[PDB]
């Protein structure tokens, strides 16, 4: 029972900045449940996110990893993937981008 | 977390009214709060919004009728001059483009 | 922006499937919120940004949409959906919108048939 992390290719969120929101990524697993965490790009490169909240959801049989904003901000605009290190192989989902749009400031 | 209303009354008309938004749980002054009014039996209808850094805009039949301000702990929606056709429950609410946590409602009504 | 929501009413059995729609005067770009109320209660968010699922509402809510259509469908219906549901345009709110409005449609008073 293999670890899986699942992001459909070319996944995309639009979200005004000021307000709430999540990214969510659903993990298979059988044994112990793996340590997952979030990463932001930056250029090719996946780095870890330490400093946002995150938290474990189980919904209809499903485990879901959740990075939340609180509020989103103009700086989360980019591209996320989450990751784990499953028997020496480095499992990453598919980057899911947040396109932050920046409020009304007239 | 949790979305809490007060200030609704009854007041005669032309009598300034401010109603109070606060929150349990998340700190309301860093979000983008609504505000939404319903005259009994009729429909939702927006007010206004104030941003995440404290700029508030209005649909235009309440600009000038209306003002919707901030303190590190609540959101205010001041009634400057109110008239009975302002008889409604107002609502506030979390975010706009995702509105989440909604306030119970506080019910005003104005009335000789 | 003027939103037309249609129908103002409808009646479905249970394990039916209703569906309402949303009409944006100019196109609003999928920034549009859903609503269910039932009475007595705050507005409660089913659906933002035309398609995206709010936490906690089962997946037989679906949005979808885009540019001026909108459409709620509520499939397998149940005696726990009837109420009055509303769309919400939020493009007010995004950088260089013309109009400060975000309003909500008329609504639609849902009847479920037992």
């Known amino acids: 029972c293999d670890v899986q992390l699942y992001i459909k290719r070319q996944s995309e969120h639009h979200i005004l900045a000021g307000d709430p929101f999540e990214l969510e990524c659903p993990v298979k697993y059988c044994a112990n449940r793996p340590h997952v965490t979030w990463c932001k790009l930056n250029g090719t490169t996946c780095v870890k996110l330490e400093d946002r909240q995150t938290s474990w959801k189980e919904e209809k049989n499903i485990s879901f990893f959740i990075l939340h904003f609180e509020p989103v901000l103009p700086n989360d605009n980019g591209s996320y993937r989450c990751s784990a290190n499953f028997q020496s192989n480095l499992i990453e989902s598919h980057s899911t981008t947040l396109y932050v749009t920046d409020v009304k400031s007239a | 977390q949790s979305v809490e209303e007060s200030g609704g009354r009854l007041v005669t008309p032309g009598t300034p009214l401010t109603l109070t938004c606060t929150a349990s749980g998340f700190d309301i002054s860093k979000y983008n709060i609504q505000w939404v009014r319903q005259s009994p039996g009729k429909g939702l209808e927006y007010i206004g919004f104030?941003?995440?850094?404290?700029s508030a805009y209005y649909a235009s039949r309440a600009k000038g009728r209306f003002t919707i301000s901030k303190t590190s702990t609540t959101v205010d929606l001041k009634i400057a001059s109110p008239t009975t056709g302002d008889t409604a429950t107002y609502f506030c609410?979390?975010?706009?483009?995702?509105?989440?946590?909604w306030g119970p409602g506080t019910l005003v009504t104005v009335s000789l | 922006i003027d939103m037309t929501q249609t129908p103002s009413s409808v009646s479905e059995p249970v394990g039916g499937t209703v569906t309402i729609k949303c009409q944006a005067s100019?196109?609003?770009?999928?920034?549009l919120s859903w609503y269910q109320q039932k009475p007595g209660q705050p507005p409660k968010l089913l659906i933002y940004?035309?398609?995206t699922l709010a936490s906690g509402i089962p997946s037989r809510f679906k949005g979808s949409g885009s540019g001026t259509e909108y459409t709620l469908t509520i499939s397998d219906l149940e005696c726990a959906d009837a109420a009055t549901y509303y769309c919400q345009c939020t493009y007010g709110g995004v950088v260089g919108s013309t109009s400060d409005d975000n309003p909500f449609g008329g609504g639609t008073e849902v009847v479920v048939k037992g």
């Open positions: 940004r035309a398609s």
């Open positions: 609410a979390r975010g706009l483009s995702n509105s989440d946590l």
């Open positions: 104030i941003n995440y850094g404290g």
């Open positions: 100019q196109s609003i770009s999928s920034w």
